[PDB]
């Protein structure tokens, strides 16, 4: 049923990897952040993850946030890495 592990099975690095892959290649298609930053190829520097202190096997997504900073643009992203299911969502 799970194409993809539970939240408290990934590690930072693990959930950064992915939300990095995944933004960078969703950012060639989003016009309009492409037009902010000025490039299809931010620069990403992360913030620290908080995980739940309690129900951590119980977590369903990962908090990833991070700014991505082009020649025109440097804005905040809150990546929702949806471990099980195998996506982000981005407010
Ligand atoms: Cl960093
Ligand atoms: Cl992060
Ligand atoms: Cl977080
Ligand atoms: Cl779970
Ligand atoms: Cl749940
Ligand atoms: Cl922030
Ligand atoms: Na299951
Ligand atoms: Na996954
Ligand atoms: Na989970
Ligand atoms: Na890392
Ligand atoms: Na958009
Ligand atoms: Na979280
Ligand atoms: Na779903």
């Known amino acids: ?5 539970a939240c408290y099975q990934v590690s930072d ?6 939300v ?7 950012m060639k298609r989003w016009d309009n952040d492409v ?3 000025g490039t299809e190829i931010p620069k990403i520097t992360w913030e620290k993850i908080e ?9 369903k997504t990962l908090l990833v946030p991070f700014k991505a900073e082009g020649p025109d643009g440097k804005r905040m992203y809150y990546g ?3 471990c099980e299911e195998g996506y982000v969502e981005y407010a």
């Open 1 to 5: 049923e799970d194409k993809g592990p």
């Open 13 to 18: 690095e693990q959930a950064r990897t992915f």
């Open 20 to 26: 990095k892959n995944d933004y960078l290649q969703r």
């Open 35 to 37: 037009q902010l930053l």
């Open 51 to 59: 995980r739940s202190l309690t129900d951590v096997e119980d977590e």
């Open 80 to 82: 929702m890495y949806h």
